[PDB]
DNA sequence: GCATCACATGAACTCCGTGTTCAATTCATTCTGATCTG
DNA sequence: ATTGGAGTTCATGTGATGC
DNA sequence: CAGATCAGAATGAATATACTAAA
């Protein structure tokens, strides 16, 4: 409620909607800030969250993004690998990530080789952008100073093979 | 009372180590009555009782169930034999070692038997096979106390073996029966397919009767993993991508392009974005330059295979006429026998005189003259095959002697034999990196410093390029022009034997160290060939075999089927059925599919009518 | 009706050859009941009756000599009792041949016997063994005329064997029981000394386990040769040389190095004074010029010892391997008998025909065709010994049917024969002497005029050097620099296999076929290990054991006892002494030596313990 | 007369001490040149050789010897041959002789081929150096016209050993 | 203690172009570690 | 000094036993 | 302050009683 609810929301940036809150397990007089996120690390943010991203990210009008935010992953691919084969050392690995907020998806390209997300990671893994993020025309750049992995499951199938 | 206890293992060094831990007094040594791996003895106390510890390690592992029935025969045998009609028993194989003395030593009599062989399924197989031979010859099993004692050591580890000495027990059963059942399955399937390939595949072709098809539970999947890459090559599906191009300005005389260190990208817009970040260059930085020294190695003695390969390449013309020239040359006689398979150059050969007979034909000239002068270096050591000495010219000729393609061939051998003795070609491989924007591009080049054998075979020579202007780190070196390019190709790079290894453990069929021997088997069976660059392109026999498999019966390929049978013969641990049904139902479904496979030899016969 | 005559040859091939000439094409050949030697029957005449001839070929030694099996138990009695308390019998060697049973089953009713074994030594044993085997077999000597006839053929040629069956003879028991004596004496000496040594030295020194210590009439000297070589190599005092060198130029870009007539001086200050008297000059004058020519000697026929020597030195092959390869080539029907001693070719041998057959191999097609033109030169008048003809190729063979050791050994066999009937190489040696101060210096050089056998055997070719420029008396060539050189006395290197043959044949340690066996024997017992360059290095165990013999009793190791025993048994061969009594005298003296060796063995143990 | 005989022996080269001459003689009686020569040849040179060399012989200051002189050779070794192969013919023979006078031992190198004196020469043999003697660096060079061995017998201290 | 007999066994005589796996010791090569100076 | 190999059956040495 | 210069681990060819001598 009120102040404590706002503080709990703003602490993690997990802007869960009221409908998602009432549909999920949010027991009154049981927990306020801790167990809600502790169980939300395995909840469908795509359905329980609001579009705190702008309206026209892919348009290119928006330049810079600031503030700590947490999002899910839907389609992460190495932009420098052929369709048939995805894993190789024939070129530096540049990761293209379809990055989901709940209503307006986007895509981010990884600059620095980071050994925290692999090409086999399950979709829906939590990735938290923390800092200044720059989009060039319709794609957002990544860096280790921005992305922090948390992990989770989007309650889906394997969507593989 | 002073009794005697014998211990069995298989490794001499492990035997010495376990003797050392058992007594710390090195025991005493008796010369090996088995002919190898001398045995040891001590006056120890196994369960605190005075017992002669006589310990031995066998030199091998008796194996080869094979047939033990003359019903094996040959072509004039009942086909049902290869399905199920085979009285199966194991033979005391490879008596070239002995194992008769092994049985004699295991005889006589022992109070207790201790087994310490390999701690795996195969080791348990050896253990049980030794057990069923030592029990019939031991003294007696008087009393309810057991006489078999198995340790639980994992590997060479002092504390582990020390505690395993107390960790005694009886070896677990049915693992040996699982593994030997796997062996008889391999026996039956391989024998079946070999018999009917000898029956039908040869087809009285005359030329193909000499060749043999050696089928196995894994040979066909290995050939399939050699050929599917060729299949995807025939698919020939191209690709599309982008390349970033830029220029760092020179002194206005030369040019200095770069290579976009983040080489290659598969996109339409991210490359455009990088261009947006790399279309307002104003200044560059010299972040790092490198200059190493590596030497190209001198060539080897020419084989028949290498000669044929370069002659199909290089001057370029087919193997049949290549072999025709080889013979005419051996005839007017300028070269030794052209069927070499060695690279040894035996010491008897007169290197000095051989190099001496060439004092003409100015193509080779004062160069080879000074090579005659001073000192000549030893050639590379090769392999001895015992066929005949390698190719080498004798009593050199000139332009008007041979002529045409025969002269071209003789020129090849002459140049290669000149190259066989020389100094290595040394060069400096320099590279300088230019830092612009969020990019750290790099350019590279080579500069030869010593020609060496480069002086004799231009077709194998380092290319000539201008030396990059080496400078200190952090210089300005501004930019010129930048560009966005495109380049694409086929599905490239028919991969090599290393990738064969990698995919081979990837699918999961094979054993601990038998991958090379399967590769050698499948190559001597004339299914694939060895090509320069360690390439493993298959041959006509292999490709027609795999195509005939795929067209009608892919089940026998089914690269996961061998792993499936392995896992269902691994699940036979613990409580389960009999081996009889497990083998019988599988083999009978395969043999029904195989009966109508024989009823459908058509596919292979049309493949023969197409390609032979 | 007709009578039957049985004849047996020593070797199967000579057997078929004798059949070829005798029956002039009337062969009735069929393999005998042994799988080793066939039987040839035909019809002819003998002393005026039309009779039938059957002939076979014993495959070697019919019987060998060995003691009673009880004393072969290795522990029944002390080897001393072997001297005069050990009855000895004869047993059929190589029972796999089943020669005794073959000669028992074949021979019934053969009234007359004629014997065609070799007329030298070591054949009388075999002839009398065959005789004593066949006497209880035929149809009894009812006729008063004797039936045992001996054939005395000198050379294996058509006319000689014609005279051979024209006139026959009778064997010589007196000289048969001389080689009998030598064989038995060697047997007892070995079976005593080697047994006692291997029993003692392994008694307490544990390192001598799993090894055999041997002693005898030939093994000990063939070890002692290399032993003395090693002793001389170790015991050496290095010194230094002092040589003066002169350097001159003739016209331009020409360098000549003079040579001092006084090749070396062994003193530093004396060399310094010689240099002092020499340096003060600038001119040199020619005194004596030469235009003398010489010739190089063409090789004889390839003897067995020489063939082994060249195979070891040039081809890098062990003597046993070389003998085995020669045996294989012989049994396949390419070259004629490996183990031969005679050098001179038969007078009636068709030298031209053999050269005619080998004219299509490309390696010699130019040189063999040229040699056929002027006519073959007569072979060198060498030496004869009444044995089989020397080694020669018998029919052409291209490399296809031959492999490795093939074009190796066979290639030398043929090249030796073409060189045998070829001409000689003519070379000119010119020596020009210069005067430097009061001293004398000269230069030497050689040149080729008309190569003879050097055009077929490259390794035995005159070295090529720049010819000295022409000079005339009274000119003063410009004098360059001089330089004194300090050298060192090079110690002798390790003994080579080629030198061992010289030390073997010259002292007559073994026979033609015994030499390869003994060299293999000493190498196998870990006495001496071969190394790079086919040199023999004695082992630590070998060195310590041999030296004790030198300091105890040299009468068992000096390379003269073999000559002594051989020279003292030929007296029996001519019947100059008593066969029974001489053996006792030889046995008696050796009996004393054996007791002394037992008595004088303690000091050897002191020498043994230094190594271990 | 005494000085006439001394001059005759000087012309023959022979230089001896007085004490030497009355020591060699069997008796101080009438003497002739032949008998005194033979009786001194019997005797050793160590006690009878007077000071007749001008010294400085070892050093290079000396350059030549004139007139008839008398010397001896004590030890002979072939400097032109090795020591282990003492009788090797790999080189032309060229000896060095340890030439003594009763006062000093010098080196005489055989410069010309010669056969009247060999390796197995009786040591202590008498030699005459009439006329020209080439002393190059303080060491003497033999010749076939001046260096003449006259033979002689002395107490054989060598016994070849 | 001795003659006997049947059984194991060695040898003489005769009739008639398979997967899997190692596999029991110690070369000369061939791809991994210490040290001043532009 | 330099030769085809496998299965069968028969003679023989010997160990076990009975007299 | 690591090329040019010298040193260790993996790769990979290695055989073992019978007595002497000699066809
Ligand atoms: Mn013979």
Nearest to C239 among D83, D90, D107 (CB): D83
B435 lies in the same domain as B287: yes
> How far apart, in whole angstroms, are the C-alpha atoms of residue B183 and residue B583?
11
Contact by Cβ (8 Å): B137, B106 = yes
Buried b (16+ CB within 10 A) or exposed e, B413-450: bbbbbbbbbbbebebeebbbbbbbeebebbbeeeebee
Q: Do D79 and C267 touch (CB under 8 A)?
A: yes
- Nucleic acid strand G within 7 Å of C318 CB: no
* CA B450 remoteness from chain centre: 35
Nearest to B270 among A82, A91, A109 (CB): A109
* Gapped junctions in chain C, after residues (C–N > 2.5 Å): none
A105 lies in the same domain as A132: yes
Q: Is residue B322 part of a domain?
A: yes
What is the DSSP track for B318-376? -HHHHHHHHHHIIIII-B--S--------TTS-HHHHHHT----TTS-HHHHHHHSS--
Packing angle, helices B497-507 and B515-524, rounded to 10: 120
C332 lies in the same domain as C440: no
**H helix or E strand, kind and range, residue C240:** strand C240-248
Q: Hey, how many other C-beta atoms are within 10 angstroms of the C-beta on B169?
A: 12
C455 lies in the same domain as C555: no
Kindly report which amino acid residue has its CA closest to the C1' atom of nucleotide E24. Answer: B59
C50 lies in the same domain as C153: yes
**Two structure tokens written together for B437:** 């924007």
Strands (E), D69-141: 70-77, 96-100, 105-109, 125-129, 133-135, 140-141
A100 lies in the same domain as A143: yes
Q: Is residue B126 part of a domain?
A: yes
Nearest to D82 among C270, C438, C489 (CB): C489
B463 lies in the same domain as B539: no
Q: Is residue C480 part of a domain?
A: yes
> How far apart, in whole angstroms, are the C-alpha atoms of residue B479 and residue B477?
7
Q: Is residue B84 part of a domain?
A: no
B318 lies in the same domain as B269: no
> How far apart, in whole angstroms, are the C-alpha atoms of residue B492 and residue B233?
8
Distance, angstroms, CA B290 to C1' E36?
20
Contact by Cβ (8 Å): C500, C536 = yes
Domains held by chain A: number = 2
A72 lies in the same domain as A144: yes
CB-based burial label for C480 (10 Å; 0-12, 13-18, 19+)? middle
Contact list, C316 vs chain B (CB under 8 Å): 346-348
**Two structure tokens written together for C49:** 């009756």
What length does chain B have? 612
Count CA atoms closer than 13 A to A71's CA, side-chain side: 26
Nearest to B416 by CA among B340, B347, B323, B348: B340
A44 lies in the same domain as A70: no
Q: Which nucleotide is nearest to B215 (CA to C1')?
A: E19
CB-based burial label for B532 (10 Å; 0-12, 13-18, 19+)? exposed
Q: Is residue B79 part of a domain?
A: no
B414 lies in the same domain as B429: no
Contact list, B261 vs chain A (CB under 8 Å): 92
Rounded to a whole number of angstroms, the distance from the CA of B388 to the nearest CA of chain C is 5
Q: Is residue A154 part of a domain?
A: no
CB-based burial label for C206 (10 Å; 0-12, 13-18, 19+)? exposed
D71 lies in the same domain as D44: no
Q: Is residue D76 part of a domain?
A: yes
Residue ranges making up the domain that contains A12? 2-48
CA C448 to each of CA B102, C179, C370, C430: distance values in angstroms, whole numbers, following the listed order: 69, 52, 19, 12
Q: Do A136 and B276 touch (CB under 8 A)?
A: yes
Q: Is residue D103 part of a domain?
A: yes
Q: Is residue B567 part of a domain?
A: yes
Which of C468, C488, C508 terminates a domain? The answer is C488
Nearest to B336 by CA among C402, C310, C315, C420: C402
C228 lies in the same domain as C246: no
Residue ranges making up the domain that contains C479? 240-297+425-488
Mention every residue, 6+ apart, whose C-beta is less than 8 A from residue C504.
C222, C225, C510, C515
Contact by Cβ (8 Å): C362, C400 = no
C29 lies in the same domain as C141: yes
Distance, angstroms, CA B31 to C1' G17?
11
> How far does chain C reach from its first CA to its final CA, in angstroms?
77
Which of B419, B440, B459 terminates a domain? The answer is B419
What is the DSSP track for B44-104? -BTTSSBEEEEEEE-SS--------SGGG--SSS-THHHHT----------TTT-SHHHHH
**Two structure tokens written together for A16:** 């869960």
Q: Which nucleotide is nearest to B214 (CA to C1')?
A: E18
Chains that touch A (3 or more CB pairs under 8 A): B
Catalytic residue among B42, B200, B330, B337: B337
> How far apart, in whole angstroms, are the C-alpha atoms of residue B404 and residue C70?
80
> How far apart, in whole angstroms, are the C-alpha atoms of residue D159 and residue D161?
5
> How far apart, in whole angstroms, are the C-alpha atoms of residue C74 and residue C517?
25
> How far apart, in whole angstroms, are the C-alpha atoms of residue B537 and residue B527?
9
D117 lies in the same domain as D77: yes
B277: domain CATH number is 2.70.20.10
What is the DSSP track for B32-47? -TTSSS-EEEE--BTT
What length does chain D have? 161
D106 lies in the same domain as D136: yes
Q: Which nucleotide is nearest to B37 (CA to C1')?
A: E24
> How far apart, in whole angstroms, are the C-alpha atoms of residue B380 and residue B421?
9
Q: Is residue C74 part of a domain?
A: no
> How far apart, in whole angstroms, are the C-alpha atoms of residue C583 and residue A2?
131
> How far apart, in whole angstroms, are the C-alpha atoms of residue B348 and residue B301?
16
Q: Is residue B460 part of a domain?
A: yes
C164 lies in the same domain as C105: yes
Contact by Cβ (8 Å): D9, D67 = no
Q: Which residues of C are catalytic?
A: 337
**Sign of torsion over alpha carbons A111, A113, A114, A119:** positive
Contact by Cβ (8 Å): B534, B497 = yes
D77: domain CATH number is 2.40.50.770
Q: Is residue D146 part of a domain?
A: yes
Which of B442, B463, B485 terminates a domain? The answer is B485
Nearest to B247 by CA among B255, B236, B237, B239: B255
Distance, angstroms, CA B512 to C1' E24?
19
> How far apart, in whole angstroms, are the C-alpha atoms of residue C453 and residue C415?
9
Nearest to C372 by CA among C359, C381, C361, C362: C359
B563: domain CATH number is 1.10.460.10
Contact by Cβ (8 Å): C267, C349 = no
B325: domain CATH number is 1.10.290.10
**β-sheet bridge partners, residue B293:** B428
The pairing of beta strand C283-289 with beta strand C426-435? antiparallel
D14 lies in the same domain as D88: no
Nearest to C215 by CA among C594, C600, C611: C594
D32 lies in the same domain as D96: no
B318 lies in the same domain as B408: yes
A70 lies in the same domain as A145: yes
A70 lies in the same domain as A14: no
**Two structure tokens written together for C5:** 């005559």
Contact list, B280 vs chain A (CB under 8 Å): none
Contact list, B277 vs chain A (CB under 8 Å): 136
DSSP, res C378: P
Q: Is residue D116 part of a domain?
A: yes
In units of Å, what resolution does this entry have? 4.2
What value, to the nearest 5°, has the Cα angle with vertex C155 and ends C150 and C156?
Answer: 90
CA dihedral C412, C415, C419, C422 (to 10 degrees): 170
DSSP, res C496: B
B461 lies in the same domain as B432: yes
Question: Which residue from A minimizes the CA distance to B243?
Answer: A80
Domains held by chain C: number = 4
D79 touches chain C (CB under 8 A): yes
Q: Hey, how many other C-beta atoms are within 10 angstroms of the C-beta on A148?
A: 14
């Amino acid at each position: 409620m009120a102040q404590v609810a706002g503080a709990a929301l703003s602490q993690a940036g997990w802007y869960l909607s009221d409908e998602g809150i009432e549909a999920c397990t949010s027991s009154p007089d049981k927990v306020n800030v801790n167990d809600i996120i502790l169980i939300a690390l395995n909840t469908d943010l795509r359905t329980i969250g609001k579009k705190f991203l702008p309206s026209d990210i892919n348009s290119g009008k928006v330049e810079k993004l600031e503030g700590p935010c947490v999002l899910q992953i839907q389609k992460i691919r190495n932009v420098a690998a052929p369709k048939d084969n995805e894993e190789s050392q024939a070129a530096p690995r540049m990761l293209r990530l379809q990055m989901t907020d709940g209503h307006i998806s986007c895509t981010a390209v990884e600059f620095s080789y980071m050994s925290k997300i692999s090409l086999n990671t399950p979709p829906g893994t939590k990735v938290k952008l923390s800092g200044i993020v720059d989009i060039k025309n319709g794609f957002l750049l990544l860096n280790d100073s921005n992305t922090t992995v948390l992990g989770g499951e989007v309650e889906h199938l394997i969507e593989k093979w | 009372v002073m009794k005697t206890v014998l211990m069995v293992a298989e490794k001499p060094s492990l035997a010495q180590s376990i003797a050392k831990i058992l007594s710390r007094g090195s025991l005493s040594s008796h010369k090996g009555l088995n002919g190898a791996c001398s045995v040891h003895e001590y006056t120890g106390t196994f369960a605190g009782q005075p017992v002669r510890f006589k310990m031995t390690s066998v030199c091998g592992h008796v194996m080869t169930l094979d047939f033990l029935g003359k019903y094996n025969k040959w072509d004039k045998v009942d086909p049902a034999e290869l399905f199920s009609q085979a009285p199966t028993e194991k033979k005391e194989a490879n008596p070239k070692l002995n194992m008769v003395k092994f049985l004699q030593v295991e005889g006589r009599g022992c109070d207790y038997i201790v087994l310490w062989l390999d701690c795996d399924k195969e080791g348990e197989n050896i253990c049980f096979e030794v057990l069923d031979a030592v029990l019939p010859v031991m003294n007696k099993a008087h009393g309810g106390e057991k006489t078999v004692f198995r340790a639980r050591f994992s590997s060479i580890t002092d504390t582990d073996i020390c505690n395993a000495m107390a960790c005694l027990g009886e070896p677990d059963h049915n693992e040996a029966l699982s593994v030997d059942a796997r062996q008889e399955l391999d026996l039956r399937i391989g024998c079946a397919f070999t018999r009917f390939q000898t029956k039908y595949f040869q087809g009285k072709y005359g030329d193909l009767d000499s060749s043999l098809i050696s089928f196995g539970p894994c040979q066909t999947p290995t050939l399939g993993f050699c050929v599917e890459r060729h299949d995807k090559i025939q698919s020939f599906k191209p690709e599309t991508y982008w390349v970033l191009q830029a220029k760092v300005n020179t002194d206005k005389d030369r040019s200095l392009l770069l290579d976009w260190d983040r080489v290659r990208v598969f996109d339409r817009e991210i490359a455009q974005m990088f261009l947006n970040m790399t279309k307002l260059e104003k200044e560059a930085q010299v972040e790092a330059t490198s200059r190493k020294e590596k030497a190209k190695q001198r060539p080897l003695a020419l084989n028949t295979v290498e000669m044929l390969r370069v002659a199909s390449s290089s001057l370029g013309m087919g193997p049949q006429h290549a072999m025709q020239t080889a013979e005419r040359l051996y005839t007017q006689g300028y070269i030794s026998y052209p069927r070499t398979e060695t690279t040894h150059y035996p010491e008897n050969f007169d290197l000095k005189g051989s190099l001496r007979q060439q004092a003409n034909h100015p193509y080779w000239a004062d160069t080879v003259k000074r090579l005659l002068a001073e000192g000549i270096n030893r050639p590379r050591k090769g392999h001895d095959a015992g066929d005949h000495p390698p190719i080498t010219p004798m009593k050199s000729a000139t332009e008007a002697e041979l002529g045409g393609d025969a002269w071209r061939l003789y020129e090849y051998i002459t140049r290669h034999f000149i190259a066989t003795v020389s100094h290595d070609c040394k060069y400096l491989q320099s590279t300088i990196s230019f830092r612009i924007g969020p990019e750290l591009f790099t350019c590279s080049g080579k500069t030869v410093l010593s020609p060496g054998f480069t002086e004799v075979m231009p077709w194998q020579s380092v290319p000539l390029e201008e030396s990059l202007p080496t400078c200190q780190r952090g210089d300005a070196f501004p930019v010129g022009e930048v560009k966005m390019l495109e380049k694409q190709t086929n599905p490239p790079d028919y991969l090599t034997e290393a990738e064969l290894i990698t995919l081979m453990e990837k699918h999961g069929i094979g054993t601990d160290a038998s991958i090379p021997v399967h590769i050698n088997n499948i190559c001597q069976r004339n299914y694939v060939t060895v090509e320069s660059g360690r390439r493993l392109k298959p041959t006509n026999l292999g490709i027609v075999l795999v195509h005939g498999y795929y067209k009608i019966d892919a089940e026998l390929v089914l690269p996961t089927i061998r792993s499936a049978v392995e896992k269902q013969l691994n699940l036979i641990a613990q409580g389960k059925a009999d081996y009889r049904q497990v083998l019988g139902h599988t083999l009978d479904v395969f043999k029904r599919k195989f009966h109508y496979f024989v009823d459908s030899i058509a596919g292979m016969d049309e493949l023969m009518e197409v390609s032979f």
